[PDB]
Amino acid sequence: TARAVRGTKDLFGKELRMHQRIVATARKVLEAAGALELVTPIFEETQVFEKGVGAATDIVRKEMFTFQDRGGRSLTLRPEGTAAMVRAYLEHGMKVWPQPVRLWMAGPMFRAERPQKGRYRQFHQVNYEALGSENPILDAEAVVLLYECLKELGLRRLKVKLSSVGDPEDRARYNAYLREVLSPHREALSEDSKERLEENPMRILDSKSERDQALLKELGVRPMLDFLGEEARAHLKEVERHLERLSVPYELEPALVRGLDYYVRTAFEVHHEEIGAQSALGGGGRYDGLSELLGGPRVPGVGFAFGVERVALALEAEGFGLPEEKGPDLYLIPLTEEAVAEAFYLAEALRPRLRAEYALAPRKPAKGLEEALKRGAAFAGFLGEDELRAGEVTLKRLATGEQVRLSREEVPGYLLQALG
């Protein structure tokens, strides 16, 4: 009856392997930069996400799998990693390790939103963090690292997008501006936008429908960029300077609306055309102050996170495939009932250095050979009355048909030199 809940799925075969390759590569580039692996629990006290992600965001307001611990305390299934990483930084007094403290991990994230192509309820993302410094070099580095992770995978058609939100103050002022300009024309907005106009109006910029877009154009709504505080623009230029020097092709966006409210200054996202909607492979930005929201000292930080699934789609789109599932090195086929147990014993002697499988019932040579082929076995091994009594085994390389009769002892050696 039961099925895997909509939005989640079982990972196996090629799909699983691709995920493992993605994380493998990310592990290399990130750790090369001095990043330390740190894995946080699947759930945190609900507050860590409420206060951190911001009580006004969609995530916090209606996309968090939150439940109560038996007795008391409200816990929530981690929807994003940053807040957690900061929580960990505080808890372990990482503030005393040599700065900056770079952390990374790869794991599942849970968002209670209606699934569609690209939007899963349970997805997996690689997360990078650089805590303890305001220096714009880390911001550039963050962007470069994300860019490299996808680059190393073989992806070529990426679109990097940089921008800044200035700061909470600048953010507030832009919002007020949008309200003053849009409110008198409120009646021309899409129902969706009309709501967004109340809390965090910026969203109306990144909304759909022609109604909104045409209006924004005629009204001559000026970019968030024009509202950046000076020091903010200085910092952003530093980042650009570094990116340009490192030859990282990017496009400066008029405004990047990131789904999380803890962002301050730097904001970026890498996209891929070959995905349709949800072209965002990954995203990130600076988030100073978050630590304080969780009740800790001021700890500056930058970082990113990319969806492994999205990246997988991108790779597939660009014609990147994976090679066939390897079969057993040897598949033992019992010709007599007494042989089945003996096949098992032989198999165990070959393991784990050699992958040896066997049938659990006696069968005709042709049939067992059929199954060995059916399992992509390199060698087929026959165990009948003759070999059992002789303490030998009849091996047969399936690719050529070459057959050899040898003692049980030689089998490991023969197979290894013939396949290694």
Added chain:
Amino acid sequence: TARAVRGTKDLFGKELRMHQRIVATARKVLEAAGALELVTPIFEETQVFEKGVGAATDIVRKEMFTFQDRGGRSLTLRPEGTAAMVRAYLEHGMKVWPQPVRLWMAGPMFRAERPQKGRYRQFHQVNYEALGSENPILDAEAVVLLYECLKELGLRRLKVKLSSVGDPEDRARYNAYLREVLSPHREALSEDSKERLEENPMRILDSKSERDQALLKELGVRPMLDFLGEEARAHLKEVERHLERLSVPYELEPALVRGLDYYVRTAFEVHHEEIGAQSALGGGGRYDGLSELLGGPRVPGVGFAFGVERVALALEAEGFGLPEEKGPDLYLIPLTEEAVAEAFYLAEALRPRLRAEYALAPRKPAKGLEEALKRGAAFAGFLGEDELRAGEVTLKRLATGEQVRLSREEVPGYLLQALG
């Protein structure tokens, strides 16, 4: 303010690495046996665990982190893997694959129980499964595989415990027996046991408190073993025969009541008497019928699962340690403010083939050298005015103190041949 919820913790450093080693080894032995990796979602429809694990077990009754879908469906945080593996088997129609279908994975499990030493609310376990056959060879194999995973890790002081719970009929008869013997003495049972007496009385055997144990002893409650039917007894002997042949040292336990109700016939556990309470490194058994509980055809199956944390404790107990975390190949130290950015640029040119780190502020040679040593860097690199203008870098192997001045171009080559 916030902390990692009690029962969970952040995995990093040596602790994290040990877990990775444990899973690494398990992956080898299991896949050598022909096991395929299959990862199920963190949560399933609450029913999968209610019906599967059995509505009478502690797990289902009061240890499941269950919550509601953002729109109805009751979901539960996976407390154990078998039921899920079976659910997956059914869903993907694995029944049409060549039998038996062996599956494995490693991941977090969540149990809402009060934590103590060894009992975490979020733990991780390696899970093995063999579906599609009743043949006792798989049961022996299962025990051998679990034994091998721990053996390969270097563990020597293990205690394998084998037993059986019989068939549904035998199971029923033993229950009736327990009721008849215990009911007239019902008043001497722990509140917990009094409930268990109603459905699946066997649990009262594996309960805690002195109240229950002393009573069971004086009442002379006979082991589940004495109630095995003919066929069950036959099957168990087959397993023993195989284990004995493979020289797997085990002890036949009188009553090995397992913590799950889906078990039928074979039941085993491996323990280590150096972890204190909760010595069970791992456990498993046969569970035919479970598939049917989930509304599917009859699918026989055997398997096990061991707690990575417990295994880690065991290894530690046996004096198994982990070596030193590798440091950066090169640590660039800026001597001027203009140098910091240049250090970053140089580092990025060396990455990812070479692990290059750097300081984010100018400092005295001696100080930067100390930091390079602190970080376990192989080579220290100086970037002062001279080298900046000369397009060179001053490298110094922290080991021999050998200092070299060379152009930025030669650096990658020099470092690689001197460390590879």
